[PDB]
Amino acid sequence: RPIMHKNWDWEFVVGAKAGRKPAIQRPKPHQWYYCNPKYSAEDPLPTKIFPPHAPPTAESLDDWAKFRKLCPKDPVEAKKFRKHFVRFLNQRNYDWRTAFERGLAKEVAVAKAAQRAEDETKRQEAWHAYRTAVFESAL
Amino acid sequence: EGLEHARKDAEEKGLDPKKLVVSTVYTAKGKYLRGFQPMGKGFAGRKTTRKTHLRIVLRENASVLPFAAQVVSPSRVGGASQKHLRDISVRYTV
Amino acid sequence: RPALTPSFSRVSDPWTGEKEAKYAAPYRIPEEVWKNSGAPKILFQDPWNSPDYDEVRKKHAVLVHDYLKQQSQPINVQTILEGVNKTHGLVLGTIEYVTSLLENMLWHDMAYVVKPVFSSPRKAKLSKIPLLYGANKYQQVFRGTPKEVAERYEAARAKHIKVAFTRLRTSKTPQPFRRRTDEYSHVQASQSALGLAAAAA
Amino acid sequence: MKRGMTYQPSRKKRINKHGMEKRLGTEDGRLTILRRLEKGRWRLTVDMFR
Amino acid sequence: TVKRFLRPGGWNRLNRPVKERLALIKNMATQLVEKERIRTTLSKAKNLQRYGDKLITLGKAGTRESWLKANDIVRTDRELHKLFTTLALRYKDRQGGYVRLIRAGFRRGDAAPVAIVELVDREGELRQARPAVTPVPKFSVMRWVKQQLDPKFISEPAPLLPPLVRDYLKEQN
RNA sequence: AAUCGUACCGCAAACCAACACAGGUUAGUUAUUGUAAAGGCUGUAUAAAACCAGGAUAAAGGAACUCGGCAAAAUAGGUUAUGUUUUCG
Ligand SMILES: [K+]
Ligand SMILES: [Mg+2]
Ligand SMILES: [Mg+2]
Ligand SMILES: [Mg+2]
Ligand SMILES: [Mg+2]
């Protein structure tokens, strides 16, 4: 079994394409796998839950192993300690999405700006050729 | 729509459309959709949607009013407009 | 690729304060011949901006900033214009354009200005003596000349120590805390791979 | 201050205050059930479901 | 004609504050250049006709100062390029009246009046506009009058490059 | 290793207020020097009455207003040699 899923339909992830379960509009971390339009029953199930936004460097994370070592011995403090650890894990899923959305926006803006520069260049080149023809025609 | 429907009815009966006159027109009450709308301080009011029936009767050579409307042509657009051929040299003379 | 004005005396600068166009006709003609003839002006000059309007502006600022770093004393705007043109060629046309570039540097603390001392506000307003500008080797967080920056830092350092101990005395943390937010996702990992390929190439 | 918000729903409160287990715990509650059986109400308690 | 009001400039209020009023008119002016024909309400059409004429005047100027003013009005680079290159040459000899307005009745829902705004010289024009330069008969009182009052009257379209510019180029080369 | 929750709304046109109600509703997180990344949202057609509401500007005078400086306006901030009162802070 792999640790992370690698085959995602990126049109679905960004939001241009509908999913395999259209009734769900905002998949949960454990619902992403079965809402993928490329879902297949032959692929082995990953051993951990990650969203499509997670980086490939998360495969070396072992969070529950570290939690046990930091476990307080007082049950009253232990219960609150565990509650804060679960809160940290859930928040990490939505830090990745925010970085994912901000990172893509910068790439899109750069590409859009580059296209704008090229279009103006072609228009100015075309006009210059027309201007030259006018002078040549008039001798 | 009622005027057109009535005229079609007259032709089927064998009347001349060029001599028809509107001789009777009246309305009649239909079935109403009742409702309620809230007001201030817990009071309430009515919210009703009304409906009506329309009846038109056309008869031949009935007494008619003399009203008649003047008719003009609309704006000329396309190849049928020739305002651009006007000669403006005449207005400079006496 | 600087372009000359229709008077063939200077280059046009990329900013909103430039009121002269760029001559672009295939043949050189005096202004008086074609300006009063009645022909369309767009056949002789380009009144618009270049496709690289923003990039050219950034390049010009670097040239001005580098030249100041090579200087050892504050100088006037006129000296800056002459020095840059001599080093690289005719690339700047007016002192007003250089002034606009300097204002951007002053705002972000990439440069500083030395102002004269006047007895009354009215004398300062009516004064016409040119100003002197310098450059910081690295960006700073305080305004003014190096002497003024040191004075401002001393006041800031005292304030920080005053605040930190007052917080401790009133049962607050001496230094504020936050949480570390993870800003590395799949998009960032692909950017790094792209960057290495560009560097290798 | 605006009035009319005397009801603040709570599922745990509703079961404990008016539930069937509560009605069967006292003699007066048992009499209330019999009164509702005599009148023939289809639902006996707010706690009832199929 | 377009009515003149008491506010600065004599423009319409278009039932909007001045800030939203200017944002709306700039967008519509950009679309008029792109498409050359638009259908809207009578008030927005009257304001757009007068605003559109003054935008063409800037394009005909063909100067650095004029382009700066227009660059704050037009919303798209492609539309701004067309204004100074294509439309500038189109209306070289036409003195005003680059836009026409024709009323087109009332709408269906709110029964508001509507009109059509279009450019006055092109392929696809609703009507055929009068020539930019009016021909003058050779034996008319009009010809004599213009000589006495305006010796520099223009009777036929002029070439892009006048003879003085052509002569200078020939002498140079 | 079984069992129950997992759709959708959640400062709201979906919850408490008879309503698509200018009211009420807990916790956890995010960009931003003088600003502010992501994300989210959007108004029948006009105008050159009286009058009403919420703003702006105003010659000369400056509480003459009024039960009453109501409302509005106003260099508002910091450091001071000296003096006064203290329960000495
Ligand atoms: K004009
Ligand atoms: Mg959900
Ligand atoms: Mg109520
Ligand atoms: Mg006054
Ligand atoms: Mg008094």
CSV table of N, CA and C (backbone and C1' of nucleotides) and ligand atoms in Angstrom, one decimal, chain B residues 42, chain D residues 2, chain F residues 17-19 21, ligand 3:
chain,number,residue,atom,x,y,z
B,42,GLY,N,-47.2,42.9,15.4
B,42,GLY,CA,-48.0,41.6,15.4
B,42,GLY,C,-49.3,41.7,14.6
D,2,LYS,N,-35.8,43.7,23.2
D,2,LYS,CA,-36.7,42.9,22.4
D,2,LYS,C,-37.1,41.6,23.1
F,17,A,P,-39.0,30.9,18.4
F,17,A,O5',-38.8,32.5,18.4
F,17,A,C5',-39.7,33.3,17.6
F,17,A,C4',-39.4,34.7,17.8
F,17,A,C3',-40.1,35.7,16.9
F,17,A,O3',-41.5,36.0,17.3
F,17,A,C1',-37.9,36.3,17.0
F,18,A,P,-42.6,36.4,16.2
F,18,A,O5',-42.4,35.4,15.0
F,18,A,C5',-42.7,34.0,15.1
F,18,A,C4',-43.8,33.6,14.2
F,18,A,C3',-43.6,33.9,12.7
F,18,A,O3',-42.8,33.0,12.0
F,18,A,C1',-45.8,34.6,13.3
F,19,C,P,-41.5,33.5,11.2
F,19,C,O5',-42.1,34.4,10.1
F,19,C,C5',-42.8,33.9,9.0
F,19,C,C4',-42.5,34.7,7.7
F,19,C,C3',-41.1,34.8,7.3
F,19,C,O3',-41.0,34.9,5.8
F,19,C,C1',-41.9,37.0,7.7
F,21,C,P,-35.5,37.9,6.8
F,21,C,O5',-36.8,38.7,7.3
F,21,C,C5',-37.1,39.9,6.8
F,21,C,C4',-37.1,41.0,7.8
F,21,C,C3',-35.7,41.1,8.6
F,21,C,O3',-35.4,42.5,8.9
F,21,C,C1',-37.4,40.6,10.1
G,3,MG,MG,-42.8,39.8,16.1
